[PDB]
Ligand binder design. Sequence first.
Ligand code: HPP
Length: 280
Amino acid sequence: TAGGYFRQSLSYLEAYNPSDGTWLRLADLQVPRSGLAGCVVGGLLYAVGGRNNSPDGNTDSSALDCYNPMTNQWSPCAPMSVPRNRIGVGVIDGHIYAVGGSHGCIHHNSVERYEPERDEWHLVAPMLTRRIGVGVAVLNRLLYAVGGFDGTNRLNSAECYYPERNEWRMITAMNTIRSGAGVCVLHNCIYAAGGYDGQDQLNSVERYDVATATWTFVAPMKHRRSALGITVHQGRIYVLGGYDGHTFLDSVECYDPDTDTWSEVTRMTSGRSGVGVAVT
Ligand SMILES: O=C(O)CCc1ccc(O)cc1
């Protein structure tokens, strides 16, 4: 987990061990950020976009920054073409897709691709929808923009990116309006967890099966949370932090699919929301 928000933007980089339950402190971000996404290419942990909320400013980020796990050092990579706060990212065969996000009052539908060994960015097909707080996930080498906020409406729609065809295709919408949901793939179906619908923070969770183009609910999380971090470790889903309408959780819940149950597995070292997350 990289970055996050609690009273201001965070530089924290911490790792959770689901075996012994403890948390490992690691090298701070060069620049604090909330509303960023995390991802892994070549075993390297990347932190994309976001925003530095502090008592001195609120600047959206175009930064891309790389952390080496054996080296514990951050390096500047090329910036995106535009700042993207509340971004979604997905990895397709070692490439970085930066999706949506905001810059001030501007709500991006644009998408951009980064080449890790070549350190370059280029724009591609824009989404059909302007999406802030978009969940992004890759399933069967296909990219999914899920949920989010267009500036007026929070979204239950979802659209799919075809790399080779470089086109966006709307798909079946979710049952539930979700902005700032945690979105990932677990088993072989896209999971969208929690989020915010313009009125409430959500605990419901729903999964999309490609072969039936259908969304189905599963067990809700224990705690309603938007701006949660999401990733998949040892065949299970992990939700981290987020906001519930009253407090910034350190609560971490773990979904068991076999039973279809969630359980709180740890507390973060400090309550927070809006982190970037990836796994090694
Ligand atoms: O729709 C929202 O306004 C944008 C995304 C967003 C959702 C929840 C949250 O706590 C922070 C950000």
